[PDB]
Point group: D2
Chain length 489, copies 4
């Protein structure tokens, strides 16, 4: 009795338990879940990797240890008592054969529910999926598979990578990851919109001038530039995160909070988006900053791991349109990039000027902002009479900052909420087959054209806000930026 | 034109009834603060006038007033009084008023100067004072404006008569009728909040609002001078003037401009759609002392010697009004006020309708917009948010703006400062107009008479409580939904 | 419903000899009597410079318009109520005996007096002066009806309007604008404020533009000399069209009370910025060689008109109302003489539907209210092409008074107007401030036109007018679809 | 091509060609389609039935003949040259075996598209479906089956049947009939709503007070009362026709005019309807009228074919609600019945009183009416200043009557447009599996309760408007009727 809406044994298999993702995220998260007592009484964690690692308490406690607490020492040891290891190659039935045995070896292993987390590279996916289905499936109880990277590099190829999994496991077993869907503020979007009347009748083309979905990271490609170069900022962030936020911000009210009823409304939106036009795109690549220090001086190409003549973009601003009765004509600006002046992700709606102005154009457009991170907050920039002996109005805002209002409660990491969702069996925060299909449908034409004609991205100094061209794009499409807005704490 | 923040002309601020309580405790201090912050024009002189052959500017004056003096200000302070002067005389014999006029012309350029007469004295005298001023003290050159303190009289007859009297001597654009609430920061802000924001436009109407509540509460009872208040009753005292005004600002249609008259027009247009108050939508109450309290808290209304032992005058009243027009047809405006209550506040609150087609299994609560006029001026909207943390269900929370933190520097001016300045700058927008006054009486007199006739006994409520339970029962019946399930932290 | 039950009333027709009197005022007043709308004790007193015999004499010889055989009885009955008086519109002596003659009538000193000024604006100043001194009734009301409020200049019209306002108070002055009395024009208010199907749509969010049209098939029938002093703007736009605009754009009034309504009207005018020379198209008609009769003679071919005139006979102007409801929506006022037909209508073209699913086969909806002829109101909308078809096409929901209400005869504007004067309803009459705002808007343009004397665009008699006008409408927002069929 | 975005052979197999439905509706219709040259050039008609029938031209021109024209004699004989007959039982593979053979015997039978119309009793459906799938399916070209009565009777026995057909044929071959979806005015509903701005912003709870879907027949159960007694008016008309109209009236704007995109929007509506409450139901049974003549004197029970102690309803008025942001709270009144005063089927919406009345309650609520039949017309009752010397307003209306406005064009019978739809492959006007499901989901609880407690229906004299109680229901739920409305031609 936990899932907010008897007990049995569960086995959390961590495929690629030796990988960076496993030791730095997956493992920590699973322990936190156990720590707060969210994991069912009978749970066992079984790591699996290519290497024959030292003891299930020796190595896997040596490598991971992120956020340990002195007084937690007891429960900590208690946790490892649930942990175990198995080594093997990700392709020879022999290795997978002893894994299965090992699980049945566990108290009630044949009865337990099996949850497989694929914390490893997309290449191996095809094979891993294959093996798991044959030799490791539980005869009783459920089996679920979590895919860390639902993306490939091409439509028709990822179509096969996808299809293959779909021919072995049915959709209600496939849990595709997009961690942003598990962040406090992102989930909140649905509540803010559908449980409030002050936001209902305004959410439409008659009131909204444009929507801006932003994603910024202050650091560049910390040495591993070689890897990133294969995907490009679009495939890395825009295609998945921003798009999801877009869906949540534009979908129609669902029949209920049921996983599928919600996802249905999401995809319905995607089906109304026409393919991206090259005319609404701005690409940029970062160059090192001479006045900086450390990584700040080294530009993208200064990374030895990246091919000397690369044109891969680290920054991209794209404009999309939703063609339906509600958003017809409203621009959705997706802007993202690495090596910028800060770190943040927010949704911002700028509304239309008030009709029949009686204040001699002193007014500025209202805006609703939902800051996902950092310092999760939501506020509405509006007008108010300039306080004091003044007649004219000025900008101000109605604010809600979780940091002060809810100073006690600690916000869980995306992964905790997500994994728990998996235990509960709530696919609502996970990507569905058709959602994937539509995401490719929209971007492939552009992506293809980019690789073909290989456009040279606009250079932008490390630490700036990016190419001026991006701002000029936003303005042209409808966004009005007012540098006249003061803020204090 | 200029934002009243720029004016060289000479100006004369005559304080009629300069010896009165209001003069020495509010008018005088306010005029000095205006001077102190350099808001009054360079050539401005202050002339106090009163019955007593009072000891000049530096003598009985500065002795009586002194409210909020600052050490290092001593210079500008003395500078101020060099501009001050006094004149004694009776409020009815031409002879006295004759020398007043002379005294003004005596001042450097008195005959050219703009004259502003603040009537800081009892309504009885208004008739005569107004009569004389018009004859012997009017300036031949430059404007002449008269500030009227108490726009309302004892009876419907008495006031309508006087208004007509003043209106025959002076034209509307010289008459500045006072209702100090119109000069409070938050009350003025109402218009900006409504008409300069799109997030508040398409929601302000019967399709989205369930009810509006205008509240006015004072924690103290009638501090000893119960005798006076007894004549007026809570309705005349607060509801008829203040609360009604806020109602106008909350329900008026968008004006053609910010021009004083264009605005006032839209205000009265609203009053014209309010049907006379029904005795069925009224809750009256009178306060009784509290035995567990201390000091004044133990003495009830009737325990005041100044009040007639068998009084039935109300100290609390909750009334429901309706505006019959395309916008507010059917929406209840609840005006609730009272003395000797649990706190001190004045706010406007709008409660919106339940969302249509609920998908959260009635866990939702109606949204609300709150504009707290005082204390700690703030405005906020109570809405729903996903319970923070590992939770799926939503809970109440709010988007807030508190002037005390966001604007911790700027000091908010007293209503009278902004108002008096308005008089200098010639902006009648924050003052009551003849027709507004009438519509006010039009609405309340039928009820007021009935009360004086049948003399209903008010419901007793212990000093310090929130008032008669019946009032709350009224609010609920008429449309308001209250739910004590709302937490708040700083 | 028409409900001091019956008091005596005197209908003084000043200028009883004039064309307007014998051709409109007299006939109308008799129609009101005939149908039994006039109070029992009513007497008609014509007055004019000449001494046109007795009542039943020249004033039955001159008028006679629409007589019916069997009515002969009531007809004679009517004239027994009529009388006449001669005199000059300026010497106290004449007006003196007029007053006497009125008191001579059964209860003249008790009777209500209604002075209809059916004479030229020049004399107004005088007539008004005299009537106030020697002809005012000591008991009962006195109401004066001003045929033309608008004069030649702004300085003059104003001076006059105020001269009258210093003698009589607003509630005695009944300024005319006959269009306010036409069936369909009054109906506007009911169509808008008594229906829900039209409420939420009447605003910038749905409406793309509004067109107020006024067309006459005939040119200036010989009397071109007189018209030349005003020009089409002052003649039709400045007054009629503008009024229709008011009724179409005003906010809902506090009640149907004359003043509560008029207030909402002028509120609109106050939000209209001065007309820009850039949104104006002027035209002057030229005769048609293939026509016949008047159709061959152009404007300048009229001897009465100065050989080198630049006065416009056609004008298309665009106006804007700057307020929360109409901000941005264009009001197209188009009018002209010597065109292809005769009609006056209000038309609203709505916006394209959002999120089209029929592959642009749709056309904008429109609401039309035809004031005349064949008074009707309809909405052009979309409907699935009837039969074995899937795609939609245009059609309409219609209401034509000619068939739906084939019995009832619609009264001439003047009947309803005059009656309104008797009942005391200024709602259908122009108010002082309304006139001021009307002047406020057009004088800037009007003066510029006279200053720079622009040459109007010539348009052949009988055509729809200058193409430029259409180009204006399109530019400003109007979309014309030649694809719309109509049968009976 | 007719529809927008050749000549293969086609075979129209009329299963149950001897039955009343065949000779009286199916056969005539197919000939009309042929007559207007709407059927493909290469089309052949094959009637199949139990009884050893004389030649098509022999015995099957004698039974049908409905709507023949003198001068059409030529094309008439031409038509019969395409017809043919086959006799056999609906169960023994032997019969079906020779049918298939006969089809292949036709010029290009093996290539031809096969269309199977099921014009026979629901009992045989299971078998026929079975046999057709085995021996008669076409190797090349499409195979579509048309079902006459998609509704059986009870949720389960009517689930069973569906599941059987859906296991032999896939959704895109099953064309479920509900002829009302093929009537001019019913189709028009979608165009009226979604192609007009004058009707957009009004279609919602903020403006509409109630919706009434009416279906009336002046004649009673003409002798064959026995058959009707098994279903009752609800199953017979309400559960199907009316409901469909409700869907079309309340559905949200679809992503496109694509058959499935539409149907999706339809079912989305049904999913929001809570089960019918016995408190919102009025049942009635007709009694004969002594002043009448002919059938008008014999009441329901006077029909020998009907069980002497029957309680089956010939009339029913039910109130349903759609719980969603658009229609939350608005009552949908579905009223129908036999032996009434007239014959008509219409959709009517009554709007709310204008807010802030200034005409001293002289106003009456606006209404939009779309009369499906007879004399198809659509109009809006509104207020207009009483014409003439009057100040006060009165009722009137903006009207559009097809009979006058479109006096030339003849409107096709539902079955013509429907059958053509099948050839064209447009399932948009046909019922989908999930739609039926939801239909029974809503009514079964009620239907059961009725057959259990056997309530006695309110008697209503033949020829009246029905039980006063029904009108009292309508008023109670919100509908305001004011007999003050005059109408002329
Ligand atoms: N920005 C800020 O500083 C800030 C922001 C949000 C909240 N807060 C604090 O939050 C606390 C509660 O917030 P709130 O005042 O907005 O909402 P609330 O207390 O839930 O209710 C507000 C209204 O309910 C009335 N009420 C209370 N109990 C009632 C009953 N039994 N029957 C009928 N009416 C009843 C209250 O009366 P009374 O008026 O007589 O109390 C008041 O008018 C307050 O102290 C508020 O100041 C402060």
């Amino acid at each position: 009795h936990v899932c907010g809406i008897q007990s049995d044994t569960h086995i959390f298999i961590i495929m690629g338990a030796s990988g960076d993702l496993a030791k730095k995220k997956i493992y920590p998260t699973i322990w936190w879940l156990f720590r707060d007592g969210l994991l069912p009484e009978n749970t066992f964690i079984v790591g699996y990797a290519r290497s024959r690692l030292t003891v299930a308490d020796i190595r896997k406690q040596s490598e991971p240890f992120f956020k340990a607490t002195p007084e937690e020492k007891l429960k900590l040891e208690d946790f490892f008592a649930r942990n175990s290891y198995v080594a093997g190659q990700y392709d020879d039935a022999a290795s997978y054969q002893r894994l299965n045995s090992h699980m049945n070896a566990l108290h009630l292993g044949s009865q337990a529910n099996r949850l497989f987390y694929l914390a490893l590279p997309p290449t191996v996916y095809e094979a891993v999926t294959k093996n798991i289905h044959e030799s490791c499936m539980s005869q009783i109880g459920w089996n679920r598979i979590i895919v860390e990277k639902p993306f490939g590099r091409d439509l028709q190829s990822s179509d096969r990578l996808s299809n293959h999994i779909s021919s072995l496991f049915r959709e209600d077993q496939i849990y595709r990851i997009d961690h942003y869907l598990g962040k406090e503020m992102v989930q909140n979007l649905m509540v803010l919109r559908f449980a409030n009347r002050i936001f209902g009748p305004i959410w439409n083309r008659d009131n909204i001038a444009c929507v801006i979905l932003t994603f910024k990271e202050p650091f560049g490609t910390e040495g591993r530039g070689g890897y990133f170069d294969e995907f490009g900022i679009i495939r890395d962030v825009m295609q998945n995160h921003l798009l999801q936020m877009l869906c949540l911000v534009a979908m129609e009210k669902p029949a209920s909070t049921n996983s599928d009823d919600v996802r249905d409304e999401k995809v319905k939106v995607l089906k109304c988006i026409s393919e991206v036009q090259a005319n609404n795109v701005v690409l940029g690549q970062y160059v090192g900053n001479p006045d900086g220090e450390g990584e700040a001086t080294k530009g993208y190409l200064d990374d030895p791991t990246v091919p000397r003549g690369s044109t891969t973009a680290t920054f991209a601003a794209v404009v999309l349109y939703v063609e339906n009765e509600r958003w017809d004509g409203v621009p959705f600006i997706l802007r993202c990039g690495k090596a910028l002046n800060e770190r943040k992700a927010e949704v911002r709606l700028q509304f239309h000027d008030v009709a029949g102005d009686i204040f001699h154009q002193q007014c500025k457009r209202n805006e609703l902002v939902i800051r996902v991170q950092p310092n999760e907050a939501v506020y509405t920039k509006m007008m108010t009479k300039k306080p004091g002996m003044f007649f004219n109005p000025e900008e101000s805002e109605l604010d809600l900052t979780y940091g002060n209002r809810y100073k006690n409660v600690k916000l869980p990491d995306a992964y905790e909420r997500l994994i728990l969702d998996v235990f509960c069996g709530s696919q609502m925060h996970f990507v569905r087959s058709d959602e994937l299909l539509e995401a490719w449908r929209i971007f492939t034409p552009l992506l293809h054209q980019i690789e073909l004609e290989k456009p040279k991205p606009i250079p932008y100094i490390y630490g700036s806000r990016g190419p001026t061209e991006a701002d000029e794009l936003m303005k042209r499409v409808g966004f009005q930026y007012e540098g006249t807005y003061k803020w204090v704490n």
